[PDB]
Amino acid sequence: ADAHKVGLIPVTLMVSGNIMGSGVFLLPANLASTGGIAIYGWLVTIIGALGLSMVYAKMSFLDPSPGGSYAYARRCFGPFLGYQTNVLYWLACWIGNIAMVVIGVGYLSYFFPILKDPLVLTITCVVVLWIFVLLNIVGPKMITRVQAVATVLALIPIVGIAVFGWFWFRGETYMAAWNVSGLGTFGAIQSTLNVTLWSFIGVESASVAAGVVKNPKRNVPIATIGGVLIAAVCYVLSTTAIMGMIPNAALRVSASPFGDAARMALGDTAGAIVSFCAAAGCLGSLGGWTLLAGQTAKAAADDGLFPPIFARVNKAGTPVAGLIIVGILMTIFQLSSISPNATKEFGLVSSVSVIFTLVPYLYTCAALLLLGHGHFGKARPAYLAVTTIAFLYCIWAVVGSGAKEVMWSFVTLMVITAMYALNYNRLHKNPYPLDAP
Amino acid sequence: ADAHKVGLIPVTLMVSGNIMGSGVFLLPANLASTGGIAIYGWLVTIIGALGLSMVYAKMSFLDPSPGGSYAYARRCFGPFLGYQTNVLYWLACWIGNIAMVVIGVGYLSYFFPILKDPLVLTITCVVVLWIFVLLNIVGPKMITRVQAVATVLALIPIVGIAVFGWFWFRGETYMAAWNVSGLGTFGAIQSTLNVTLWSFIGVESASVAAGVVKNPKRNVPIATIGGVLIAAVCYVLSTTAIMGMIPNAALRVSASPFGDAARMALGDTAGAIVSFCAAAGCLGSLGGWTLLAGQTAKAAADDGLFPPIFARVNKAGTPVAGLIIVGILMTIFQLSSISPNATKEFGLVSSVSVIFTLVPYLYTCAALLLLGHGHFGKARPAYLAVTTIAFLYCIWAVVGSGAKEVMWSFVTLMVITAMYALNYNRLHKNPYPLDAP
């Protein structure tokens, strides 16, 4: 916990930055099709999210192992589900970076419109991806410092509106569009949840990165809960404020409602600032998620549950080869941005890989109960209550997702089972083996 | 103990009877929207299905444990996946019985058309379900003897056509409808697989019933492979024969095309004989699937991985309380046949519970490799190849299913994980526990 370890502040900002990412600037537009009643959804979401964060906070307290969810799963269920957890989470991590870099450079197209030409966009995206791979190769202190700065920058317009927009906030504007979904109350709330439940992916960030965090038993829980709280407060305040500052129709039509509304309100410099800050958030988030990919792959390979090259490190302990591999894969999938059709072809892959993350969450909740029951004391009813909420959080997220995406997630589980069996027979140790031949 | 065990012939007819079931008399009508090219789909399916049956034969040879797949999954993956396997398979067993009894009683409405009134149909179904529950309480020797007779009766119109229909078979008829799907060759085959891959559910029957089979190390592998071969040969010969005897247009439209083709070819008694035999097939299958439900639940409860009541037995070792609980559950869901709308609602459930079975298949495949590698010798490549083909059968079945049904299957996995964790924490043994509190 000295030289190559990351301090509390950069880790906390990595959690909140990984969570807020691209999404925070786009949330009001997505929620505007439902209306102000979305506040109820937020209320439901945050209680769930906090629950999940607490689950991680306690689990990482009990076991600050590198790789987080993976390790926990491995502890309570064994090598097969550890293997599965890592495959799913690793894939989610680097596949999710494509959309993020596309959105991020997209924000930068405010200054340089050539970035909307799909070819230049693709080249630029590949270059930026490799920039953050290289920053990750320099080391975790470097990447978390870069993301810390990026996250503060991204927080500038969010906190700005979330504090000072209230002078322009009109309750009549907010309530004029309380429910424009056409649905009853539960339906409207559900259509809200279909957006907001996915807003807290990244809660697991500090847990997974526990191996490079200074004093992780103390700092990982703090960073987890703190990052989630920062995200929640920003989410609510900013979306509510904007819903009270801008008429619902305009909010619905806008593709960048902080930026379009900023550019119109305080001038073009405002739009430039919001665009720059949004781009900063996205690009820093790239660094964070790449770090997480490297870490999970490294822990799994360290246990012989992922190819050994993912555990090959330099003198600093950085998984350089694994990061380069992730770079190559991301580069290959990034080619989808060369055309609208190519982009939409890739879209269902992204949507599926986002669902991948929920299995690590589920196993983390289960791991908390199965591994840590002897640490609960007479606060056991509370733990059960919180973890159950966290369980519900995950399940509901899937319940509201598109059927096709979940179908292909299921297929992915099956393929992973087949892969484990075909690659690890003779190596795998059985809980209840057959007698000797 | 040997006195309440079932011999080779009845177990083999239980496998082939559980496989053929309701399906066999409806296949030609289902395949007629594709056409004669379905033979290509049969060839692919039968290679996959034989592969899966070889896997079950070899695994049960190495470990003829009660509960089949449940036991193998617990061995190679531990209590959690054992628990999951049983819940899934148990549910699939008794939930699937609802559609089967409706179809079976449906056939009997050829004689008694009052059975087509939804109210009389539901009462009758409830009564018939309790009959086969009560026969199971008499014992496995009684239920497999009843099913053996029923299966042989059900085979009379099937084998009759598959041997003697060829006198009326015409290639011009068959080839006039070679491909009426409107799709290309791969697509036509795929539309065939969407039907035929689900035609071999029940391959696991002898394996799951190993605890009531005489000399199971010998007889389960024979009955498993033997039963599948009987189904495969019957499926192919009879669907092919009918597609060459009856014009595609008429075949596409028939609700009972062995019955419609028979009743009009050799007279009204012919339609009576086919109706009675098809009803026998369905009802016998009710008995066997109910037996399997009792066996899997008992095997899990014996290991403390299902409620204790499911392991309470009479002097003969029959899980009487377990059978009664399944009777009650079946009765509650059987209420869905009182109305068309009531039946449509229940339909998704049946559709979902059918996918459940493939997870046990998948774990059985993994278990063979994981547990049994040391028994392969240098015949190892053959085992890897066959098991890989069995893996592909399972994945392919799912890839071709409706998205919504697979989604709710995924959700069910999540709920089960949450249930395991909330029910078995403090009892569950962790592979890598934390240190002492």
CSV table of C-alpha atoms in Angstrom, one decimal, chain A residues 193-419:
chain,number,residue,atom,x,y,z
A,193,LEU,CA,-36.7,1.7,-14.6
A,194,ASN,CA,-35.9,0.3,-18.1
A,195,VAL,CA,-33.5,3.3,-18.3
A,196,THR,CA,-32.5,4.1,-14.7
A,197,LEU,CA,-31.7,0.6,-13.4
A,198,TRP,CA,-28.9,0.4,-15.9
A,199,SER,CA,-27.5,3.8,-14.8
A,200,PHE,CA,-25.4,2.3,-12.0
A,201,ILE,CA,-23.3,-0.2,-13.9
A,202,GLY,CA,-19.8,0.3,-12.5
A,203,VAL,CA,-20.7,0.0,-8.8
A,204,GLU,CA,-18.3,-2.9,-8.7
A,205,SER,CA,-15.3,-0.9,-10.0
A,206,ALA,CA,-13.3,-0.5,-6.8
A,207,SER,CA,-14.0,-4.1,-5.8
A,208,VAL,CA,-12.6,-5.4,-9.0
A,209,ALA,CA,-9.6,-3.0,-8.9
A,210,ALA,CA,-8.9,-4.0,-5.2
A,211,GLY,CA,-5.5,-5.3,-6.1
A,212,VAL,CA,-4.1,-1.9,-7.0
A,213,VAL,CA,-5.9,0.1,-4.3
A,214,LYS,CA,-4.0,1.3,-1.3
A,215,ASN,CA,-5.4,-0.1,2.0
A,216,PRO,CA,-8.2,-1.8,0.1
A,217,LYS,CA,-10.1,-3.2,3.2
A,218,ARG,CA,-10.6,0.4,4.2
A,219,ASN,CA,-10.7,2.3,0.9
A,220,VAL,CA,-12.6,0.0,-1.5
A,221,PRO,CA,-15.9,0.0,0.6
A,222,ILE,CA,-15.6,3.8,1.1
A,223,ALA,CA,-15.0,4.4,-2.7
A,224,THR,CA,-17.9,2.0,-3.6
A,225,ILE,CA,-20.5,3.7,-1.5
A,226,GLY,CA,-19.2,7.2,-2.1
A,227,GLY,CA,-19.0,6.8,-5.8
A,228,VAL,CA,-22.6,5.4,-5.9
A,229,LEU,CA,-23.8,8.3,-3.7
A,230,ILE,CA,-22.2,10.9,-6.0
A,231,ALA,CA,-23.7,9.3,-9.0
A,232,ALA,CA,-27.2,9.1,-7.5
A,233,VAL,CA,-27.2,12.7,-6.3
A,234,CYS,CA,-26.0,14.0,-9.7
A,235,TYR,CA,-28.5,11.8,-11.6
A,236,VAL,CA,-31.5,13.0,-9.6
A,237,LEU,CA,-30.6,16.7,-9.3
A,238,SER,CA,-29.6,17.1,-12.9
A,239,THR,CA,-32.5,15.3,-14.5
A,240,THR,CA,-35.1,16.9,-12.3
A,241,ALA,CA,-33.6,20.4,-12.9
A,242,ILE,CA,-33.4,20.0,-16.6
A,243,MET,CA,-37.0,18.7,-16.7
A,244,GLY,CA,-38.0,21.9,-14.9
A,245,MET,CA,-35.9,24.2,-17.1
A,246,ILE,CA,-36.7,22.9,-20.6
A,247,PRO,CA,-40.2,22.1,-22.1
A,248,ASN,CA,-40.8,18.3,-22.6
A,249,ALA,CA,-41.1,18.4,-26.4
A,250,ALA,CA,-37.7,20.1,-26.9
A,251,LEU,CA,-36.2,17.8,-24.3
A,252,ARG,CA,-37.5,14.7,-26.2
A,253,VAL,CA,-36.2,16.0,-29.5
A,254,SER,CA,-32.7,17.0,-28.3
A,255,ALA,CA,-29.8,14.5,-28.7
A,256,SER,CA,-27.7,16.5,-26.3
A,257,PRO,CA,-30.0,18.3,-23.8
A,258,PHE,CA,-27.3,19.8,-21.6
A,259,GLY,CA,-25.4,21.0,-24.7
A,260,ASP,CA,-28.2,22.2,-26.9
A,261,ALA,CA,-29.9,23.8,-23.9
A,262,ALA,CA,-26.5,25.2,-22.8
A,263,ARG,CA,-25.6,26.5,-26.2
A,264,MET,CA,-29.0,28.3,-26.5
A,265,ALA,CA,-29.0,29.6,-22.9
A,266,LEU,CA,-25.5,31.0,-22.2
A,267,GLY,CA,-24.2,31.1,-25.6
A,268,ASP,CA,-21.9,29.0,-27.8
A,269,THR,CA,-19.1,29.0,-25.2
A,270,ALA,CA,-21.5,27.2,-22.9
A,271,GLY,CA,-22.1,24.5,-25.5
A,272,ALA,CA,-18.3,24.2,-26.0
A,273,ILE,CA,-17.8,23.8,-22.3
A,274,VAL,CA,-20.5,21.2,-21.9
A,275,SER,CA,-19.3,19.3,-25.0
A,276,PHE,CA,-15.7,19.3,-23.7
A,277,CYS,CA,-16.7,18.1,-20.3
A,278,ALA,CA,-19.0,15.3,-21.6
A,279,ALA,CA,-16.2,14.1,-23.9
A,280,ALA,CA,-13.9,14.2,-20.9
A,281,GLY,CA,-16.2,12.0,-18.9
A,282,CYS,CA,-16.6,9.4,-21.6
A,283,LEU,CA,-12.9,9.2,-22.4
A,284,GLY,CA,-11.8,8.9,-18.8
A,285,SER,CA,-14.4,6.2,-18.4
A,286,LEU,CA,-12.6,4.3,-21.2
A,287,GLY,CA,-9.4,4.2,-19.0
A,288,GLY,CA,-11.3,3.0,-16.0
A,289,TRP,CA,-13.1,0.2,-17.8
A,290,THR,CA,-9.9,-1.0,-19.6
A,291,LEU,CA,-8.2,-1.1,-16.2
A,292,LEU,CA,-11.0,-3.3,-14.9
A,293,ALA,CA,-10.7,-5.7,-17.9
A,294,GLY,CA,-7.0,-6.1,-17.2
A,295,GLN,CA,-7.6,-6.7,-13.5
A,296,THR,CA,-10.4,-9.3,-13.8
A,297,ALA,CA,-8.5,-11.2,-16.5
A,298,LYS,CA,-5.3,-11.1,-14.4
A,299,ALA,CA,-7.0,-12.5,-11.3
A,300,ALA,CA,-8.7,-15.3,-13.2
A,301,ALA,CA,-5.5,-16.2,-15.0
A,302,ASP,CA,-3.6,-16.1,-11.6
A,303,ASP,CA,-6.0,-18.9,-10.5
A,304,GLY,CA,-5.5,-20.9,-13.7
A,305,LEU,CA,-9.1,-20.0,-14.8
A,306,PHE,CA,-8.1,-17.9,-17.9
A,307,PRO,CA,-5.3,-18.1,-20.4
A,308,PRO,CA,-1.9,-17.6,-18.7
A,309,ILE,CA,-0.8,-14.7,-20.9
A,310,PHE,CA,-3.4,-12.5,-19.1
A,311,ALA,CA,-1.4,-13.0,-15.9
A,312,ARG,CA,2.0,-12.0,-17.5
A,313,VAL,CA,3.1,-8.8,-15.8
A,314,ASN,CA,5.9,-6.2,-15.9
A,315,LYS,CA,8.0,-5.4,-12.8
A,316,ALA,CA,5.2,-3.1,-11.6
A,317,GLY,CA,2.6,-6.0,-11.7
A,318,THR,CA,0.8,-4.4,-14.7
A,319,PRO,CA,-0.8,-7.0,-17.0
A,320,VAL,CA,0.7,-5.4,-20.2
A,321,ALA,CA,0.1,-8.3,-22.6
A,322,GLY,CA,-3.5,-8.6,-21.5
A,323,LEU,CA,-4.1,-4.9,-21.9
A,324,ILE,CA,-2.6,-5.1,-25.4
A,325,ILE,CA,-4.9,-8.1,-26.2
A,326,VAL,CA,-8.0,-6.1,-25.0
A,327,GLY,CA,-6.7,-3.3,-27.2
A,328,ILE,CA,-6.6,-5.5,-30.3
A,329,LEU,CA,-10.1,-6.9,-29.6
A,330,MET,CA,-11.5,-3.5,-29.1
A,331,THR,CA,-9.8,-2.3,-32.3
A,332,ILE,CA,-11.4,-5.2,-34.2
A,333,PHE,CA,-14.9,-4.5,-32.9
A,334,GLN,CA,-14.4,-0.7,-33.4
A,335,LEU,CA,-14.5,-1.2,-37.1
A,336,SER,CA,-18.3,-1.3,-36.8
A,337,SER,CA,-18.4,2.5,-36.8
A,338,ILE,CA,-17.4,2.9,-40.4
A,339,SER,CA,-21.1,2.9,-41.5
A,340,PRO,CA,-24.6,3.2,-40.0
A,341,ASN,CA,-25.4,-0.4,-41.0
A,342,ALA,CA,-22.1,-1.7,-39.5
A,343,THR,CA,-22.9,0.3,-36.4
A,344,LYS,CA,-26.4,-1.2,-35.9
A,345,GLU,CA,-25.1,-4.7,-36.7
A,346,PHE,CA,-22.8,-4.3,-33.6
A,347,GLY,CA,-25.6,-2.9,-31.4
A,348,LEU,CA,-27.2,-6.1,-30.2
A,349,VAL,CA,-23.7,-7.4,-29.2
A,350,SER,CA,-23.3,-4.3,-27.0
A,351,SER,CA,-26.8,-4.6,-25.6
A,352,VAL,CA,-26.2,-8.3,-24.7
A,353,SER,CA,-22.7,-7.6,-23.1
A,354,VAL,CA,-24.4,-5.0,-20.9
A,355,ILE,CA,-26.6,-7.8,-19.5
A,356,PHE,CA,-23.4,-9.8,-18.9
A,357,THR,CA,-22.6,-7.6,-15.9
A,358,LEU,CA,-25.6,-8.6,-13.8
A,359,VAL,CA,-24.4,-12.2,-13.2
A,360,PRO,CA,-21.3,-11.0,-11.3
A,361,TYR,CA,-23.7,-8.8,-9.2
A,362,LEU,CA,-25.9,-11.8,-8.4
A,363,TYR,CA,-23.0,-13.9,-7.4
A,364,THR,CA,-21.6,-11.1,-5.3
A,365,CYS,CA,-24.9,-10.9,-3.3
A,366,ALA,CA,-24.9,-14.7,-3.0
A,367,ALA,CA,-21.3,-14.7,-1.9
A,368,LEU,CA,-22.0,-12.1,0.8
A,369,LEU,CA,-24.6,-14.3,2.3
A,370,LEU,CA,-22.9,-17.7,1.8
A,371,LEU,CA,-19.4,-16.6,2.9
A,372,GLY,CA,-20.0,-13.9,5.4
A,373,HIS,CA,-22.9,-15.2,7.5
A,374,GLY,CA,-20.6,-15.7,10.5
A,375,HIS,CA,-19.7,-12.0,10.4
A,376,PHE,CA,-23.3,-10.7,10.6
A,377,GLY,CA,-23.9,-11.0,14.3
A,378,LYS,CA,-27.4,-10.0,15.4
A,379,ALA,CA,-27.5,-7.5,12.5
A,380,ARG,CA,-28.3,-10.6,10.3
A,381,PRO,CA,-31.9,-9.5,9.5
A,382,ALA,CA,-30.6,-6.2,8.0
A,383,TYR,CA,-28.0,-8.0,5.8
A,384,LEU,CA,-30.7,-10.4,4.5
A,385,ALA,CA,-32.9,-7.4,3.9
A,386,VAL,CA,-30.3,-5.4,2.0
A,387,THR,CA,-29.0,-8.3,0.0
A,388,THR,CA,-32.5,-9.3,-1.0
A,389,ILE,CA,-33.1,-5.7,-2.2
A,390,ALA,CA,-29.9,-6.0,-4.2
A,391,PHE,CA,-31.1,-9.3,-5.6
A,392,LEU,CA,-34.3,-7.7,-6.7
A,393,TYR,CA,-32.4,-4.9,-8.3
A,394,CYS,CA,-30.6,-7.3,-10.6
A,395,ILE,CA,-33.6,-9.4,-11.4
A,396,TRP,CA,-35.8,-6.4,-12.2
A,397,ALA,CA,-33.2,-5.1,-14.5
A,398,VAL,CA,-33.4,-8.3,-16.6
A,399,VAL,CA,-37.2,-8.4,-16.3
A,400,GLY,CA,-37.5,-5.1,-18.1
A,401,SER,CA,-34.9,-5.8,-20.8
A,402,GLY,CA,-35.5,-6.7,-24.4
A,403,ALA,CA,-36.2,-10.4,-24.9
A,404,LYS,CA,-33.6,-11.0,-27.7
A,405,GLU,CA,-30.7,-9.6,-25.7
A,406,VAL,CA,-31.5,-11.8,-22.7
A,407,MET,CA,-31.9,-14.8,-25.0
A,408,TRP,CA,-28.4,-14.3,-26.4
A,409,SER,CA,-27.1,-13.8,-22.8
A,410,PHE,CA,-28.5,-17.3,-22.0
A,411,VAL,CA,-26.9,-18.7,-25.1
A,412,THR,CA,-23.6,-17.2,-23.9
A,413,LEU,CA,-24.0,-18.9,-20.6
A,414,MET,CA,-24.4,-22.3,-22.4
A,415,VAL,CA,-21.3,-21.7,-24.6
A,416,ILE,CA,-19.3,-20.8,-21.5
A,417,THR,CA,-20.3,-24.1,-19.9
A,418,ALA,CA,-19.3,-26.0,-22.9
A,419,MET,CA,-15.9,-24.1,-23.1
